[PDB]
Amino acid sequence: VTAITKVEREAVLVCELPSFDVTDVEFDLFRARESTDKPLDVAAAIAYRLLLGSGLPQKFGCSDEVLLNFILQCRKKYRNVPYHNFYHVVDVCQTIHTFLYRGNVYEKLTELECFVLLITALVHDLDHMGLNNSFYLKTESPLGILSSASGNTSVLEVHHCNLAVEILSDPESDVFDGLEGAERTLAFRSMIDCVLATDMAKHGSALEAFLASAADQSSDEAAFHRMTMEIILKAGDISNVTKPFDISRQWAMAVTEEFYRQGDMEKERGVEVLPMFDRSKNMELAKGQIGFIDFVAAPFFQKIVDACLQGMQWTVDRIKSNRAQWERVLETR
Ligand SMILES: COc1ccc(C2=NN(C3CCCCCC3)C(=O)[C@@H]3CC=CC[C@H]23)cc1-c1ccc(C(=O)NCC(N)=O)cc1
Numbered sequence: 516v517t518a519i520t521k522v523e524r525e526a527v528l529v530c531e532l533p534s535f536d537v538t539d540v541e542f543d544l545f546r547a548r549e550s551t552d553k554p555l556d557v558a559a560a561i562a563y564r565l566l567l568g569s570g571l572p573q574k575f576g577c578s579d580e581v582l583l584n585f586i587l588q589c590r591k592k593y594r595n596v597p598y599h600n601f602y603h604v605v606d607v608c609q610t611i612h613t614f615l616y617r618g619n620v621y622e623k624l625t626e627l628e629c630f631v632l633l634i635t636a637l638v639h640d641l642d643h644m645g646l647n648n649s650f651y652l653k654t655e656s657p658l659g660i661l662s663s664a665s666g667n668t669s670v671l672e673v674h675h676c677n678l679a680v681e682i683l684s685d686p687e688s689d690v691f692d693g694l695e696g697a698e699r700t701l702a703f704r705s706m707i708d709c710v711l712a713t714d715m716a717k718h719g720s721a722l723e724a725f726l727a728s729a730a731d732q733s734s735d736e737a738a739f740h741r742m743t744m745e746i747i748l749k750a751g752d753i754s755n756v757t758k759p760f761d762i763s764r765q766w767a768m769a770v771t772e773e774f775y776r777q778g779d780m781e782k783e784r785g786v787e788v789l790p791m792f793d794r795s796k797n798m799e800l801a802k803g804q805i806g807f808i809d810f811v812a813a814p815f816f817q818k819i820v821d822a823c824l825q826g827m828q829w830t831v832d833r834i835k836s837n838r839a840q841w842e843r844v845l846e847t848r
């Protein structure tokens with residue numbers, strides 16, 4: 516990795532984000548990307564500001580410059596794809612900030628853990644190519660073969676973790692260089708555990724483990740922390756439907772498109788194409804958003820709120836409300 520230049524840093528630092536509150540649950544990253552013709556620097560500054568406003572990097576000996584070098588080393592490794600690009604990980608970072616500090620989930624974690632979560636957000640989809648793990652396995656692509664041969668089916672998540680480790684192995688971009696011994700180990704392990712937990716194939720069992728730990732007043736305390744961190748990063752990653760309707764809708768269009776591209780490539784390769792990824796097999800968002808709400812997001816948010824994260828009730832209220840709004844799209848079609 517080439518080190519970050521004074522000039523790259525400068526270009527982020529000049530962005531002032533007039534009229535945006537990055538800490539608000541109704542912050543609108545799409546309005547932010549439009550606001551200038553340098554949307555990547557704006558996103559970077561959003562992340563810089565979120566991290567500095569937490570007060571956390573300062574506490575763990577991470578200078579403002581090492582923080583920003585890191586953000587930029589992360590950013591150079593995202594791709595120009597419709598959904599799993601740099602704006603997604605910035606969105607996850609911001610969203611986590613709100614769960615921690617508007618939803619008071621910070622009370623369940625140490626400051627270090629809060630810090631790790633915010634950093635982990637920005638590493639968690641590094642070098643994503645717009646194709647899911649299933650694609651690499653079905654096509655016997657080289658990374659798919661390596662994953663099968665090595666016994667880990669989380670093709671992409673292990674890859675993201677490998678790139679996060681390389682960024683952090685340079686002191687210039689190691690946000691954890693101020694740590695040592697147990698703390699350093701904890702930062703790396705918890706970051707890696709959270710990224711590995713974002714594989715949706717493990718959704719049900721990560722949710723069930725957290726729920727059973729929350730209900731158990733004798734749960735091991737370090738395990739409860741780790742799982743809380745995992746569940747918060749997962750919540751960030753499926754949080755699109757917890758946002759104001761127009762925001763949620765623009766996310767939905769972005770993912771939908773990326774899925775369709777995968778499906779096109781799966782056609783051109785002659786492998787199985789799921790209906791979800793099949794262009795010629797769908798005419799509408801509404802039914803798909805509702806489906807995702809009903810089977811994935813609403814049960815996830817409601818369970819974790821009721822189990823433990825009472826402060827995040829707004830997410831459940833907003834899902835309910837977005838669902839009703841998609842139902843009006845159907846009722847009036
Ligand atoms: C905002 O919506 C989403 C947000 C995140 C994800 C993610 N799915 N998974 C899985 C995908 C397989 C089965 C469902 C469970 C979740 C991922 O592992 C992604 C990466 C990590 C987290 C969630 C992401 C998916 C959606 C979404 C995309 C398309 C439709 C749709 O019905 N497609 C047809 C149409 N024509 O409408 C509906 C919702």
Ligand SMILES: [Mg+2]
Pocket residue numbers: 639640671713
């Ligand atoms: Mg991912």
Ligand SMILES: [Zn+2]
Pocket residue numbers: 603607639640713752
């Ligand atoms: Zn993600």
